[PDB]
């Protein structure tokens, strides 16, 4: 599943720090039952200092 590994996606999740921000997909989990399989890496950190977050494919579009 997922759009593609190594692709550029835009986050549609409202409560994330990287909403409407360009991110790079580093891992998509193909195991069933995982709610947020797509792991997206960002060039900028959030207030917690991390750049790695998991999103569903419904919360991302290819840009």
């Amino acid at each position: 599943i997922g759009p593609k590994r190594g692709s550029i996606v835009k986050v549609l999740r409202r409560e994330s720090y990287w909403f409407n921000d360009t991110g790079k997909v580093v891992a998509v989990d193909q195991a069933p039952g995982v709610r947020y399989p797509v792991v997206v890496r960002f060039d900028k950190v959030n207030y917690a200092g991390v750049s790695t977050n998991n999103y569903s494919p419904d919360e991302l579009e290819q840009s």
Partner: protein, 742 residues
């Protein structure tokens, strides 16, 4: 076992570590990602314990940082002697100092600031200095500005030597950990080599240079025709005409005929009536005695020659039935922790600076120090602020020792473990005596304000109302005035003029010193002082004692020193940290030291400083209003904060108008502090998010993400502007008022 352990070239002298800013910390070595990285870059710049876990490299960093500090102080002294040499009227002031104000700073005529070059006297224009360098150079025997220029270039040479030694003891030959752990040798060479030989060398200067030049300055001799300092050493008959005891020529020293040195080594006491400053025969006997006493005390500890003391053997033999295994491991505290030694040294240096402030208004060591009231107020005020800052930093590094260097395995059942074991009793009884002092001093002030407001002057605490005379101070001042007759025979006069031995010293028509009265007002303001010092001790000692843990947070030592909080839990854990107790003790140091210097300024402008006319009448600056107005807050606001501020606000259009500008800008920095102190991070973070949105709209977003300042950083910025603005307010008000009326 004491010997030199160094090793050669630890780190290569390279600029590749200058280019990477956060090289010392592992978190900052990855580069910036937010704007808080810049603030943690400066916050962790000097924190050498957070860089490495090796105490050897930490101690080398501290040693070369000491050398860099010494280089900065020698650059500063080079500047102040170069300003005396080129940009001062020191020869003009030295011709006659009772009419020409000390000035050593010339401004450039650019934007209207040339009005700040005021008429200080002697055909000179410049900023009137209040640092006391002119009286210090008069006490040093400096006659010409060529000597000031030579001392400036010599200080520049020593500043280059401290920079070379700071490079040398980090990059060429840096000492190892057991070299710094030889504390017995360090105390032996600081007591004997530094404070003993330093006092002996300054005693030799005050025998050969300060004493004959300052004796000729008391005779009205012009400093251009006074012989140069080496002429007293060379022509010893010229030195013998001022003191006949020099005609014997060092034979009474080795034959123990020291009383034949009674011409130039005296125990007089009091002030020179010509100048208003202490005698240099007493200051030379003082330095010779503290040198023959610090050199004796420097031969106490055991280095490697057999004789001496192991101070672990001193400590471990000091154990009592109320403590048990006390004083044991404190040597391991004070040789493996830099912060514990920093706490003790900072407490002694701050308390010592407070000793310096009191022992300089009261026993003025320099000629024409007392009668130049601007110098006395600025020197007392400066040393009180430095002393308060250093004792708050003493409690700070005490708390950093607890959170980062206190090992509980090595400290069982000693003094420190038991002090931690009953810290609730210490803080609670300190809390009780602070509340008791707060009512019994400030509520006494509120009572005086209330009955003075209600038209009951007899229901107050005045010298005319219910009296509260300080009978212990009024007895210790009589004990120090009636001392020379029986308890201290060999004294010509008394220690200070402020004791009660008469001797109304008039220098230049202005009062140097006289007997200082102590009444109900002094009792009230000394209980204010004891209260404020006790509350500062309460916040600071609470932060030291509850740095490890509390009843609230039992894992507070894992959270560190500069952490904001645990969170909104347990009702709210805001400012639980020991850092936040240093942060609040900085405010209580502001309160304590500001009331100390306010009591100082009003007490000596009302009861000491003034003028003497004919037939022995003394008119003070604010005549006799300390005994009646300094018992109410309305008098403090009215006859001190309003009447004496009538020269800082109408100084505009004059040479003292920069004091008005910095008075107002100091109010600005204080009200700017209240922005950081009262607010919090998350509001400013979301406001910065709106500003970042406006930057994203116009494609001017920085990659270094704009962040609000941290909670510890916001409190630090707020307390820095609070201290800077309030201290600069008092600096501007003091240095406008006492220059204007002095």
């Amino acid at each position: 076992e004491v010997k030199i352990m160094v090793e050669k070239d630890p780190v290569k002298t390279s600029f590749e570590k200058w280019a990477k800013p956060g090289h010392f910390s592992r978190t900052l070595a990855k580069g910036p990602n937010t704007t808080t990285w810049i603030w943690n870059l400066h916050a962790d710049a000097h924190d050498f314990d957070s860089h490495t876990n090796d105490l050897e490299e930490i101690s080398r960093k501290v040693f070369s940082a000491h050398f860099g500090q010494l280089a900065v102080i020698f650059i500063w002294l080079s500047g102040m002697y170069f300003h005396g040499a080129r940009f001062s009227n020191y020869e003009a002031w030295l011709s006659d100092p009772t009419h020409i104000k000390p000035s050593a700073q010339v401004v450039w005529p650019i934007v209207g600031q040339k009005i700040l070059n005021g008429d200080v006297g002697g055909g000179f224009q410049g900023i009137q200095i209040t640092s006391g360098f002119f009286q210090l150079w008069r006490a040093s025997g400096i006659t010409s500005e060529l000597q000031l220029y030579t001392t400036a270039i010599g200080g520049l040479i020593f500043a280059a030597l401290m920079l070379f030694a700071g490079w040398f003891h980090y990059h060429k030959a840096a000492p190892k950990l057991a070299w710094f752990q030889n504390v017995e040798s360090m105390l032996n060479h600081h007591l004997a080599g530094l404070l003993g030989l330093g006092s002996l060398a300054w005693a030799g200067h005050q025998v050969h240079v300060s004493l004959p030049i300052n004796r000729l300055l008391d005779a009205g001799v012009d400093p251009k025709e006074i012989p140069l300092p080496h002429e007293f050493i060379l022509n010893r008959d010229l030195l013998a005409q001022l003191y006949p005891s020099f005609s014997k020529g060092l034979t009474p020293f080795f034959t123990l005929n020291w009383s034949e040195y009674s011409d130039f080594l005296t125990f007089r006491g009091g002030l020179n009536p010509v100048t208003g400053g202490l005698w240099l025969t007493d200051t030379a006997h003082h330095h010779l005695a503290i040198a023959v006493l610090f050199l004796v005390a420097g031969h106490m500890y055991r280095t490697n020659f057999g004789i001496g003391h192991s101070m672990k053997e001193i400590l471990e033999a000091h154990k009592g039935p109320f403590t048990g295994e006390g004083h044991k491991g404190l040597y391991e505290i004070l040789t493996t922790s830099w912060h514990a030694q920093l706490a003790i040294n900072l407490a002694m240096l701050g308390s010592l600076t407070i000793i310096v402030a009191h022992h300089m208004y009261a026993m003025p060591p320099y000629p024409y120090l007392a009668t130049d009231y601007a110098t006395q107020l600025s020197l007392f005020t400066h040393h009180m602020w430095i002393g308060g800052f250093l004792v708050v930093g003493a409690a700070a590094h005490a708390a950093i020792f607890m959170v980062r260097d206190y090992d509980p395995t090595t400290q069982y059942n000693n003094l420190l473990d038991r002090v931690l074991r009953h810290r609730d009793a210490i803080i609670s009884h300190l809390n009780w005596v602070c509340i008791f002092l707060g009512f019994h001093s400030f509520g006494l002030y509120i009572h005086n304000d209330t009955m003075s407001a209600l038209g009951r002057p007899q229901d107050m605490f005045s010298d005319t109302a219910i009296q509260l005379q300080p009978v212990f101070a009024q007895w210790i001042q009589n004990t120090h005035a009636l001392a020379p007759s029986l308890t201290a025979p060999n004294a010509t006069a008394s220690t200070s003029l402020t004791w009660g031995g008469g001797d109304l010293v008039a220098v230049g028509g202005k009062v140097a010193l006289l007997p200082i009265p102590l009444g109900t007002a002094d009792f009230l303001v000394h209980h204010i002082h004891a209260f404020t010092i006790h509350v500062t001790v309460l916040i600071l000692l609470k932060g030291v004692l509850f740095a490890r843990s509390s009843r609230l947070i039992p894992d507070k030592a894992n959270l560190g020193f500069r952490f904001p909080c645990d969170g909104p839990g347990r009702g709210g854990t805001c400012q639980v940290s020991a850092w936040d107790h240093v942060f609040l003790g900085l405010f209580w140091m502001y309160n304590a030291i500001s009331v100390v210097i306010f009591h100082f300024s009003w007490k000596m402008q009302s009861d000491v400083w003034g003028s003497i006319s004919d037939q022995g009448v003394v008119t003070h600056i604010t005549g006799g209003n300390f005994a009646q107005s300094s018992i109410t807050i309305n008098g403090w606001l009215r006859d001190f904060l309003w009447a004496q501020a009538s020269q800082v606000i109408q100084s505009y259009g004059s040479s003292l108008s920069a004091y008005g500008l910095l008075f107002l800008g100091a109010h600005f920095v204080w009200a700017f502090s209240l922005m950081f102190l009262f607010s919090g991070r998350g509001y400013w973070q979301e406001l910065i998010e709106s500003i970042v949105w406006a930057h994203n709209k116009l494609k001017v977003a920085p990659a270094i993400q704009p962040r609000a300042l941290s909670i510890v950083q916001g409190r630090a910025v707020g307390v820095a502007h609070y201290l800077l603005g309030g201290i600069a307010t008092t600096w501007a008000f003091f240095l406008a008022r006492i220059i204007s009326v002095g």
